[PDB]
């Protein structure tokens, strides 16, 4: 009982023809493609009620659709613009089973009009203020991830190689490093707070983990910098005394 | 023919206060309604489904919703909001009792939950960059939820919005914002300026 989309993010160029896949292991007859945009909820592009079948949803314009096999539903953007910049979401269901919709996990698509603009983040960690340690007997580390485009990052924290949820806050949206340029690079901060006892034990390891998503193996690149592929940039600090 | 509307794209309430998320529908046929939740980093998950079984429908995570045919409505409530309730919520309608056939979704409501900060001591702290190099961030932290944090005025100085972190080791929440630059005149005793409480510790 799962639905999996081929990609989790992609970057693509204005005008390019685009292909997302969606597969399900439940033998479901019904498959649906939506997009989700802020303020507009989920809107149905195309659905399919059997193998070889399709039907237009509410916003079919610009999109195409293929149900070749029962288990799979391809969505094709004819010519990429930044009106198709969005989050895409596949779902399936059965006709007789009473269970409703199972959703995939989505694929984020961003369409840019030039591919030499995509950068990974670099990631610095800033150790607490002693002033804070003194006043509060708590300690806050800050992680910056900077110089990334497009806005595709997943920031995590690890304490002694074990992901931590408690004591974390990451900005829900990023600020623009150059907020005039149409497609400026982005920056995003995050905070990890622990007790000063914890910060002040030299055995403890703290790692800011950042996974970024840019270019696949396939994409052409003959620029001077490292091909800005999907990757994990981390940063590191130890306990102090 | 079916449609759905969610009046209110953004709702902010206090921790422990009443949560109410609206949904209204039109349907030429018998309708079936659903609520979905989308937590910051996860996918869409079912909260509750109205099936013709009964009028008040209970769901997951403390939520409930009454189906009012006379009104045109299926509003989502929870009496006491919890921080963990922050997310986007989506209402949807179908012609199938099970939601097996095509769902029509609304425009969503993002729910933001405001922390009750019990014992505030707002301050501004300077943190050093790592590997013994000196670039500078400022952390404005521990402030009351009344305090908002305006954008910069200087372009090449960066200020994030406030953010809430929840230490459950110690049953302790705290708000913070970050300001940084590389400019020579940047210092943490003047990076924030904007409805910022007079009793801040600055060292």
mmCIF file of N, CA, C and O in Angstrom, chain B residues 2-61:
data_model
loop_
_atom_site.group_PDB
_atom_site.id
_atom_site.type_symbol
_atom_site.label_atom_id
_atom_site.label_comp_id
_atom_site.label_asym_id
_atom_site.label_seq_id
_atom_site.Cartn_x
_atom_site.Cartn_y
_atom_site.Cartn_z
ATOM 1 N N UNK B 2 -19.662 19.802 -8.408
ATOM 2 C CA UNK B 2 -19.206 20.006 -7.058
ATOM 3 C C UNK B 2 -18.087 21.009 -6.931
ATOM 4 O O UNK B 2 -17.217 21.032 -7.776
ATOM 5 N N UNK B 3 -18.080 21.725 -5.793
ATOM 6 C CA UNK B 3 -17.085 22.723 -5.430
ATOM 7 C C UNK B 3 -16.982 22.908 -3.901
ATOM 8 O O UNK B 3 -17.887 22.523 -3.128
ATOM 9 N N UNK B 4 -15.873 23.498 -3.474
ATOM 10 C CA UNK B 4 -15.558 23.678 -2.076
ATOM 11 C C UNK B 4 -14.838 24.958 -1.817
ATOM 12 O O UNK B 4 -13.913 25.274 -2.562
ATOM 13 N N UNK B 5 -15.162 25.642 -0.713
ATOM 14 C CA UNK B 5 -14.479 26.897 -0.352
ATOM 15 C C UNK B 5 -13.963 26.942 1.048
ATOM 16 O O UNK B 5 -14.723 26.671 1.946
ATOM 17 N N UNK B 6 -12.736 27.387 1.265
ATOM 18 C CA UNK B 6 -12.159 27.549 2.603
ATOM 19 C C UNK B 6 -11.849 29.000 2.838
ATOM 20 O O UNK B 6 -10.787 29.476 2.380
ATOM 21 N N UNK B 7 -12.849 29.754 3.391
ATOM 22 C CA UNK B 7 -12.695 31.145 3.765
ATOM 23 C C UNK B 7 -11.668 31.226 4.883
ATOM 24 O O UNK B 7 -11.941 30.666 5.931
ATOM 25 N N UNK B 8 -10.618 32.033 4.703
ATOM 26 C CA UNK B 8 -9.511 32.136 5.603
ATOM 27 C C UNK B 8 -8.400 31.242 5.086
ATOM 28 O O UNK B 8 -8.453 29.992 5.273
ATOM 29 N N UNK B 9 -7.420 31.829 4.433
ATOM 30 C CA UNK B 9 -6.200 31.169 4.027
ATOM 31 C C UNK B 9 -5.173 31.004 5.193
ATOM 32 O O UNK B 9 -4.450 30.046 5.186
ATOM 33 N N UNK B 10 -5.169 31.925 6.157
ATOM 34 C CA UNK B 10 -4.293 31.911 7.323
ATOM 35 C C UNK B 10 -5.058 32.199 8.641
ATOM 36 O O UNK B 10 -5.672 33.221 8.792
ATOM 37 N N UNK B 11 -4.957 31.322 9.611
ATOM 38 C CA UNK B 11 -5.518 31.448 10.954
ATOM 39 C C UNK B 11 -4.346 31.327 11.947
ATOM 40 O O UNK B 11 -3.533 30.360 11.871
ATOM 41 N N UNK B 12 -4.210 32.313 12.808
ATOM 42 C CA UNK B 12 -3.306 32.271 13.953
ATOM 43 C C UNK B 12 -4.058 32.290 15.242
ATOM 44 O O UNK B 12 -4.820 33.209 15.423
ATOM 45 N N UNK B 13 -3.851 31.290 16.109
ATOM 46 C CA UNK B 13 -4.397 31.302 17.478
ATOM 47 C C UNK B 13 -3.355 31.063 18.518
ATOM 48 O O UNK B 13 -2.292 30.625 18.194
ATOM 49 N N UNK B 14 -3.665 31.361 19.769
ATOM 50 C CA UNK B 14 -2.849 30.999 20.922
ATOM 51 C C UNK B 14 -2.883 29.504 21.228
ATOM 52 O O UNK B 14 -3.910 28.816 21.065
ATOM 53 N N UNK B 15 -1.734 29.018 21.680
ATOM 54 C CA UNK B 15 -1.643 27.706 22.265
ATOM 55 C C UNK B 15 -2.799 27.536 23.281
ATOM 56 O O UNK B 15 -2.989 28.406 24.092
ATOM 57 N N UNK B 16 -3.587 26.470 23.180
ATOM 58 C CA UNK B 16 -4.707 26.235 24.082
ATOM 59 C C UNK B 16 -6.031 26.892 23.720
ATOM 60 O O UNK B 16 -7.044 26.657 24.388
ATOM 61 N N UNK B 17 -6.030 27.703 22.665
ATOM 62 C CA UNK B 17 -7.255 28.380 22.252
ATOM 63 C C UNK B 17 -7.965 27.553 21.236
ATOM 64 O O UNK B 17 -7.441 26.588 20.723
ATOM 65 N N UNK B 18 -9.194 27.965 20.978
ATOM 66 C CA UNK B 18 -10.094 27.251 20.102
ATOM 67 C C UNK B 18 -9.588 27.289 18.654
ATOM 68 O O UNK B 18 -9.123 28.291 18.191
ATOM 69 N N UNK B 19 -9.659 26.163 17.959
ATOM 70 C CA UNK B 19 -9.288 26.123 16.548
ATOM 71 C C UNK B 19 -10.543 25.903 15.788
ATOM 72 O O UNK B 19 -11.284 25.016 16.099
ATOM 73 N N UNK B 20 -10.742 26.687 14.756
ATOM 74 C CA UNK B 20 -11.919 26.566 13.885
ATOM 75 C C UNK B 20 -11.470 26.814 12.427
ATOM 76 O O UNK B 20 -10.832 27.816 12.172
ATOM 77 N N UNK B 21 -11.727 25.863 11.533
ATOM 78 C CA UNK B 21 -11.262 25.974 10.157
ATOM 79 C C UNK B 21 -12.546 25.788 9.323
ATOM 80 O O UNK B 21 -13.254 24.779 9.525
ATOM 81 N N UNK B 22 -12.846 26.732 8.425
ATOM 82 C CA UNK B 22 -14.099 26.672 7.697
ATOM 83 C C UNK B 22 -14.005 25.928 6.431
ATOM 84 O O UNK B 22 -13.015 25.979 5.799
ATOM 85 N N UNK B 23 -15.100 25.289 6.059
ATOM 86 C CA UNK B 23 -15.287 24.640 4.783
ATOM 87 C C UNK B 23 -16.769 24.667 4.445
ATOM 88 O O UNK B 23 -17.539 24.262 5.252
ATOM 89 N N UNK B 24 -17.126 25.095 3.236
ATOM 90 C CA UNK B 24 -18.434 25.128 2.699
ATOM 91 C C UNK B 24 -18.406 24.519 1.336
ATOM 92 O O UNK B 24 -17.429 24.604 0.668
ATOM 93 N N UNK B 25 -19.503 23.972 0.874
ATOM 94 C CA UNK B 25 -19.491 23.187 -0.359
ATOM 95 C C UNK B 25 -20.749 23.446 -1.115
ATOM 96 O O UNK B 25 -21.705 23.878 -0.560
ATOM 97 N N UNK B 26 -20.700 23.149 -2.417
ATOM 98 C CA UNK B 26 -21.875 23.087 -3.309
ATOM 99 C C UNK B 26 -21.774 21.800 -4.067
ATOM 100 O O UNK B 26 -20.697 21.454 -4.563
ATOM 101 N N UNK B 27 -22.922 21.162 -4.248
ATOM 102 C CA UNK B 27 -22.965 19.830 -4.844
ATOM 103 C C UNK B 27 -24.367 19.563 -5.415
ATOM 104 O O UNK B 27 -25.327 19.568 -4.669
ATOM 105 N N UNK B 28 -24.517 19.325 -6.707
ATOM 106 C CA UNK B 28 -25.867 19.059 -7.236
ATOM 107 C C UNK B 28 -26.357 17.685 -6.762
ATOM 108 O O UNK B 28 -27.577 17.448 -6.716
ATOM 109 N N UNK B 29 -25.411 16.802 -6.396
ATOM 110 C CA UNK B 29 -25.698 15.416 -5.922
ATOM 111 C C UNK B 29 -25.439 15.280 -4.390
ATOM 112 O O UNK B 29 -24.868 16.210 -3.749
ATOM 113 N N UNK B 30 -25.795 14.109 -3.796
ATOM 114 C CA UNK B 30 -25.380 13.887 -2.398
ATOM 115 C C UNK B 30 -23.866 13.998 -2.223
ATOM 116 O O UNK B 30 -23.161 13.349 -2.917
ATOM 117 N N UNK B 31 -23.391 14.863 -1.321
ATOM 118 C CA UNK B 31 -21.946 15.053 -1.098
ATOM 119 C C UNK B 31 -21.278 14.183 -0.021
ATOM 120 O O UNK B 31 -21.889 13.756 0.925
ATOM 121 N N UNK B 32 -19.974 14.027 -0.155
ATOM 122 C CA UNK B 32 -19.202 13.352 0.847
ATOM 123 C C UNK B 32 -17.956 14.203 1.050
ATOM 124 O O UNK B 32 -17.272 14.486 0.142
ATOM 125 N N UNK B 33 -17.658 14.555 2.277
ATOM 126 C CA UNK B 33 -16.614 15.469 2.581
ATOM 127 C C UNK B 33 -15.515 14.855 3.404
ATOM 128 O O UNK B 33 -15.731 13.850 4.104
ATOM 129 N N UNK B 34 -14.355 15.510 3.358
ATOM 130 C CA UNK B 34 -13.121 14.936 3.898
ATOM 131 C C UNK B 34 -12.299 16.056 4.399
ATOM 132 O O UNK B 34 -12.310 17.094 3.777
ATOM 133 N N UNK B 35 -11.532 15.858 5.443
ATOM 134 C CA UNK B 35 -10.490 16.790 5.801
ATOM 135 C C UNK B 35 -9.104 16.102 5.765
ATOM 136 O O UNK B 35 -8.928 15.002 6.313
ATOM 137 N N UNK B 36 -8.130 16.780 5.183
ATOM 138 C CA UNK B 36 -6.764 16.347 5.064
ATOM 139 C C UNK B 36 -5.866 17.346 5.814
ATOM 140 O O UNK B 36 -6.196 18.518 5.864
ATOM 141 N N UNK B 37 -4.754 16.871 6.390
ATOM 142 C CA UNK B 37 -3.777 17.728 7.060
ATOM 143 C C UNK B 37 -2.437 17.503 6.409
ATOM 144 O O UNK B 37 -2.185 16.431 5.953
ATOM 145 N N UNK B 38 -1.585 18.519 6.351
ATOM 146 C CA UNK B 38 -0.248 18.452 5.712
ATOM 147 C C UNK B 38 0.739 19.103 6.657
ATOM 148 O O UNK B 38 0.788 20.324 6.721
ATOM 149 N N UNK B 39 1.451 18.272 7.468
ATOM 150 C CA UNK B 39 2.400 18.753 8.506
ATOM 151 C C UNK B 39 3.640 19.176 7.757
ATOM 152 O O UNK B 39 3.890 18.633 6.670
ATOM 153 N N UNK B 40 4.356 20.218 8.297
ATOM 154 C CA UNK B 40 5.414 20.946 7.628
ATOM 155 C C UNK B 40 6.165 20.113 6.646
ATOM 156 O O UNK B 40 5.971 20.323 5.461
ATOM 157 N N UNK B 41 6.906 19.116 7.090
ATOM 158 C CA UNK B 41 7.681 18.284 6.176
ATOM 159 C C UNK B 41 6.981 17.012 5.572
ATOM 160 O O UNK B 41 7.554 16.414 4.678
ATOM 161 N N UNK B 42 5.777 16.602 5.990
ATOM 162 C CA UNK B 42 5.117 15.358 5.398
ATOM 163 C C UNK B 42 4.114 15.611 4.262
ATOM 164 O O UNK B 42 3.903 16.785 3.878
ATOM 165 N N UNK B 43 3.559 14.502 3.728
ATOM 166 C CA UNK B 43 2.412 14.498 2.805
ATOM 167 C C UNK B 43 1.002 14.724 3.433
ATOM 168 O O UNK B 43 0.837 15.047 4.613
ATOM 169 N N UNK B 44 -0.001 14.596 2.579
ATOM 170 C CA UNK B 44 -1.404 14.762 2.891
ATOM 171 C C UNK B 44 -1.893 13.502 3.648
ATOM 172 O O UNK B 44 -1.610 12.365 3.210
ATOM 173 N N UNK B 45 -2.502 13.663 4.819
ATOM 174 C CA UNK B 45 -3.071 12.520 5.536
ATOM 175 C C UNK B 45 -4.532 12.718 5.957
ATOM 176 O O UNK B 45 -4.946 13.821 6.329
ATOM 177 N N UNK B 46 -5.345 11.672 5.860
ATOM 178 C CA UNK B 46 -6.758 11.828 6.233
ATOM 179 C C UNK B 46 -6.999 12.224 7.734
ATOM 180 O O UNK B 46 -6.488 11.629 8.592
ATOM 181 N N UNK B 47 -7.741 13.294 8.026
ATOM 182 C CA UNK B 47 -8.099 13.630 9.415
ATOM 183 C C UNK B 47 -9.417 13.052 9.786
ATOM 184 O O UNK B 47 -9.584 12.588 10.903
ATOM 185 N N UNK B 48 -10.367 13.180 8.868
ATOM 186 C CA UNK B 48 -11.729 12.703 9.048
ATOM 187 C C UNK B 48 -12.510 12.747 7.793
ATOM 188 O O UNK B 48 -12.172 13.467 6.888
ATOM 189 N N UNK B 49 -13.547 11.903 7.757
ATOM 190 C CA UNK B 49 -14.388 11.703 6.565
ATOM 191 C C UNK B 49 -15.839 11.649 7.001
ATOM 192 O O UNK B 49 -16.121 11.076 8.084
ATOM 193 N N UNK B 50 -16.703 12.376 6.255
ATOM 194 C CA UNK B 50 -18.169 12.379 6.432
ATOM 195 C C UNK B 50 -18.819 11.495 5.378
ATOM 196 O O UNK B 50 -18.672 11.704 4.212
ATOM 197 N N UNK B 51 -19.626 10.558 5.809
ATOM 198 C CA UNK B 51 -19.967 9.423 4.980
ATOM 199 C C UNK B 51 -21.474 9.220 4.817
ATOM 200 O O UNK B 51 -21.879 8.252 4.148
ATOM 201 N N UNK B 52 -22.299 10.072 5.436
ATOM 202 C CA UNK B 52 -23.746 9.758 5.710
ATOM 203 C C UNK B 52 -24.033 8.882 6.962
ATOM 204 O O UNK B 52 -25.219 8.579 7.259
ATOM 205 N N UNK B 53 -22.968 8.470 7.670
ATOM 206 C CA UNK B 53 -23.092 7.638 8.878
ATOM 207 C C UNK B 53 -23.679 8.436 10.042
ATOM 208 O O UNK B 53 -24.642 7.990 10.642
ATOM 209 N N UNK B 54 -23.075 9.599 10.362
ATOM 210 C CA UNK B 54 -23.686 10.607 11.271
ATOM 211 C C UNK B 54 -23.172 12.076 11.115
ATOM 212 O O UNK B 54 -22.169 12.383 10.409
ATOM 213 N N UNK B 55 -23.884 12.955 11.818
ATOM 214 C CA UNK B 55 -23.704 14.386 11.737
ATOM 215 C C UNK B 55 -22.410 14.918 12.409
ATOM 216 O O UNK B 55 -21.657 15.579 11.783
ATOM 217 N N UNK B 56 -22.136 14.637 13.669
ATOM 218 C CA UNK B 56 -20.877 15.088 14.250
ATOM 219 C C UNK B 56 -19.884 13.968 13.980
ATOM 220 O O UNK B 56 -20.128 12.833 14.351
ATOM 221 N N UNK B 57 -18.775 14.281 13.314
ATOM 222 C CA UNK B 57 -17.764 13.293 12.918
ATOM 223 C C UNK B 57 -16.502 13.548 13.733
ATOM 224 O O UNK B 57 -16.021 14.644 13.729
ATOM 225 N N UNK B 58 -15.987 12.564 14.462
ATOM 226 C CA UNK B 58 -14.721 12.729 15.183
ATOM 227 C C UNK B 58 -13.586 12.228 14.286
ATOM 228 O O UNK B 58 -13.751 11.269 13.528
ATOM 229 N N UNK B 59 -12.428 12.840 14.430
ATOM 230 C CA UNK B 59 -11.269 12.512 13.615
ATOM 231 C C UNK B 59 -10.017 12.327 14.417
ATOM 232 O O UNK B 59 -10.085 12.307 15.573
ATOM 233 N N UNK B 60 -8.871 12.303 13.766
ATOM 234 C CA UNK B 60 -7.589 12.153 14.466
ATOM 235 C C UNK B 60 -7.050 13.418 15.101
ATOM 236 O O UNK B 60 -7.515 14.520 14.806
ATOM 237 N N UNK B 61 -6.069 13.257 15.996
ATOM 238 C CA UNK B 61 -5.444 14.434 16.642
ATOM 239 C C UNK B 61 -6.386 15.495 17.323
ATOM 240 O O UNK B 61 -5.992 16.655 17.412
#
